[PDB]
Amino acid sequence: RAELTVPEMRQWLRNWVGKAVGKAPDSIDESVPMVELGLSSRDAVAMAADIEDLTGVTLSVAVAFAHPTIESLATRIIE
Numbered sequence: 664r665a666e667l668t669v670p671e672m673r674q675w676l677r678n679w680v681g682k683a684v685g686k687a688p689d690s691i692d693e694s695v696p697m698v699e700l701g702l703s704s705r706d707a708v709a710m711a712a713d714i715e716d717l718t719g720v721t722l723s724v725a726v727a728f729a730h731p732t733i734e735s736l737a738t739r740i741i742e
């Protein structure tokens with residue numbers, strides 16, 4: 664499949680968060696609230712910009728906090 668997939672989006676988010684908080688991406692828990700992962704508000708701005716560059720989607724506050732886990736956010740960005 665050519666289009667960006669949910670597994671790819673999940674991996675991209677784990678890698679992004681892992682780099683921001685200094686942890687292995689494989690250890691990033693995809694079911695916990697993203698506000699509990701150790702990200703800063705500056706991180707949120709940067710990650711939103713990077714998601715827009717990757718997907719062309721400008722994430723709204725509403726969508727993001729209604730899908731507040733890596734796995735639910737990834738699913739909603741793609742789907």
Ligand SMILES: [Ca+2]
Pocket residue numbers: 682683684685
């Ligand atoms: Ca950091």
Ligand SMILES: [Ca+2]
Pocket residue numbers: 692693694695
């Ligand atoms: Ca979990």
Ligand SMILES: [Ca+2]
Pocket residue numbers: 712715716
């Ligand atoms: Ca841009």
